[PDB]
From a paper:
[name] is a [name]/38 effector that also binds to the endosomal/lysosomal R-SNARE VAMP7. [name] binding regulates VAMP7 participation in SNARE complex formation and can therefore influence VAMP7-mediated membrane fusion events. [name] is an endosomal Rab GTPase, thought to have been present in the last eukaryotic common ancestor, with Rab38 arising in vertebrates as an evolutionary gene duplication of [name] (Klöpper et al., 2012). [name] has been shown to interact with [name]/38 via its first ankyrin repeat-containing domain (Tamura et al., 2009, 2011; Wang et al., 2008).
Numbering used by the authors:
A (entry chain D): 453 to 620
B (entry chain E): 453 to 618
C (entry chain A): 22 to 148, 153 to 197
D (entry chain B): 21 to 199
Write the structure that this text describes.
Amino acid sequence: VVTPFSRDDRGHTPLHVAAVCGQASLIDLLVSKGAMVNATDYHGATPLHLACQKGYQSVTLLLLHYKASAEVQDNNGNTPLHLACTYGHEDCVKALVYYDVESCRLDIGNEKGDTPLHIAARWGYQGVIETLLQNGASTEIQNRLKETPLKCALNSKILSVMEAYHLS
Amino acid sequence: VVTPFSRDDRGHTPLHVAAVCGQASLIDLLVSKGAMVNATDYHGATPLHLACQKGYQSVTLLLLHYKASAEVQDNNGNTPLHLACTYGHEDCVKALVYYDVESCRLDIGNEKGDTPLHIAARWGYQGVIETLLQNGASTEIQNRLKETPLKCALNSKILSVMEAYH
Amino acid sequence: REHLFKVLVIGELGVGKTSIIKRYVHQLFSQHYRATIGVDFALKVLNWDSRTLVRLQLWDIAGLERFGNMTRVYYKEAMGAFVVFDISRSSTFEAVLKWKSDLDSKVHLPNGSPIPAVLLANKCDQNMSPSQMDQFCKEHGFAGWFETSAKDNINIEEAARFLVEKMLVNHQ
Amino acid sequence: TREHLFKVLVIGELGVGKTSIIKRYVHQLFSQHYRATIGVDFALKVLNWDSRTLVRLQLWDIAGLERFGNMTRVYYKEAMGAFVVFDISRSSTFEAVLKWKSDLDSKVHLPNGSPIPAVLLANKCDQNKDSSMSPSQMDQFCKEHGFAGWFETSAKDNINIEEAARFLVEKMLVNHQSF
Ligand SMILES: Nc1nc2c(ncn2[C@@H]2O[C@H](COP(=O)(O)OP(=O)(O)CP(=O)(O)O)[C@@H](O)[C@H]2O)c(=O)[nH]1
Ligand SMILES: Nc1nc2c(ncn2[C@@H]2O[C@H](COP(=O)(O)OP(=O)(O)CP(=O)(O)O)[C@@H](O)[C@H]2O)c(=O)[nH]1
Ligand SMILES: [Mg+2]
Ligand SMILES: [Mg+2]
């Protein structure tokens, strides 16, 4: 039968492989057979991290269902939510923000001190930015280089979208 | 029971939606219930195009299995192979290049006259570039702006990888 | 005192689910149909009392998703649901009992009793008596029903409140 | 030169050596460093069978995980033959070959309706021998379960990979004179 604790030399379990392929029935099976959901690969990446970078919302939710943790940090200090913010997958960003009614933290800084809202401002993903703001994302909280999320905004458009909220 | 010909106002069938979600059992079901595999959305995009842009190799193969066409062009003249070359998904690029045991054509130009190898050189994806060259990708064929794929190479490193072959 | 309620919105495709939510939360409407992809989410905050704040997590569930294996995941620990159909399409009404089966067989309250469900007859601004709806609801375990239009903002507020009321009772 | 093109499956359990066998055969390289294959990988081998004949091998590298995932009907379709691989240093991976063999045969036939030629590979033969299986027993095994043949191989040291490839190409060229 399946050995769900099997590793390769980058620390990829089968459950990591299932995540990055989107194969959700595989996930069901692997979890059912023992697989460690918050297994970390050689650079600190959870299968949830892989789902949130590929943008598979289906898998992201299925993992969170099977009690994956969203607060795990990779070598770069990134949660899965950071990774979904850097690659703009708002469908995944939402799954994370809403899965748990004690909702995702949002103040967690990576190695560069960037919260998810910084990252979202940087690459200019508006829908993401909004979703985050709607759920309480701080606009002051200050990255390592002493920047706020406003500071990080791409253009005057995105900037003003954020300022909208700040004032409220 | 399911209506697989249903359209929204961008011309997305359920099979388009399944593709972009990676939900492969959905695809199986939809195809089984009638769904048009080479259905094109409002901007000329096949569900295979969506799979090859999201990079879902699983789905891209399952579509090809259910007889999707790889030579369909979107509003920008891109085949799914172009889209997989622009976003670097070599796992998908490979599926396309190897599915069919004849070829699959690598000379198809998009609106800008770019073949897949141009696009791969541009963004510098080495594994892609190689896979294409190994399966015959021409190095001369000239985009609209009169560029070759070599011309389009990112750096001297990639350039030489291509010159290796030619 | 703050509550937070996961509310499902479910029903067949094109039935109006996304537009109901978008109206309720951002007072907007489009005529343009963009199919929802998997599950969309929205947050409504409201001031029930001086004493009470409630917060609604609105889970917008693509009408396609009932032919996939993912509903057990979306539904889990839901505090209640809007089941939606399109008055202008009888087929979508027959569907509500599919969705209702799915729902009840996969989410219960803490008590073990089914979760409060409110039936929405949407698109009521276009072209089943009230006494029949009541019999229908009474037979199939809907708390209640409403003719709604996201286009014109009929009855969406009132439906929300009716359901919040039910769920606040259940928090006893 | 007539040109042939053969889809060849490479299958078997995880870490068993499939990718490295292919990488050796095609690029003469070996790494000790295990990178799990994700879904399906591909490679192309060209070879000069003689004066008159060129053959071209599409090598379908199939993650050992993929046998628990119902995508195998897709990968296998219209395959012209297969390497089934196990790790001489792990008896568990040998028990597995009959799983993979079942899967294969129940889902791909030749044009004739007969099963496709399958060659069993006992890989990592440069280490120490675990399956309790003499050469005369391998032959009985192959004979009983419809393998064309078997080979002890090492991608590490390039044992027997060439000879296995040829043995299989030979089988499949025979089958091209049956349709
Ligand atoms: N007249 C009228 N039209 C409506 C109303 N609500 C929605 N529509 C129209 O019906 C169409 C479908 O609405 P939508 O909210 O996308 O439906 P949906 O249930 O989310 C369909 P899916 O589940 O695939 O995402 C839209 O084009 C919308 O403008 C309404 O109350 N009245
Ligand atoms: N000594 C020795 N080691 C080998 C040989 N072939 C492979 N290995 C080692 O075994 C490990 C796994 O090899 P790999 O080819 O990646 O196995 P695989 O079947 O492709 C594993 P998967 O199917 O899960 O991708 C690697 O560390 C590799 O170096 C061999 O012939 N001899
Ligand atoms: Mg919708
Ligand atoms: Mg491999």
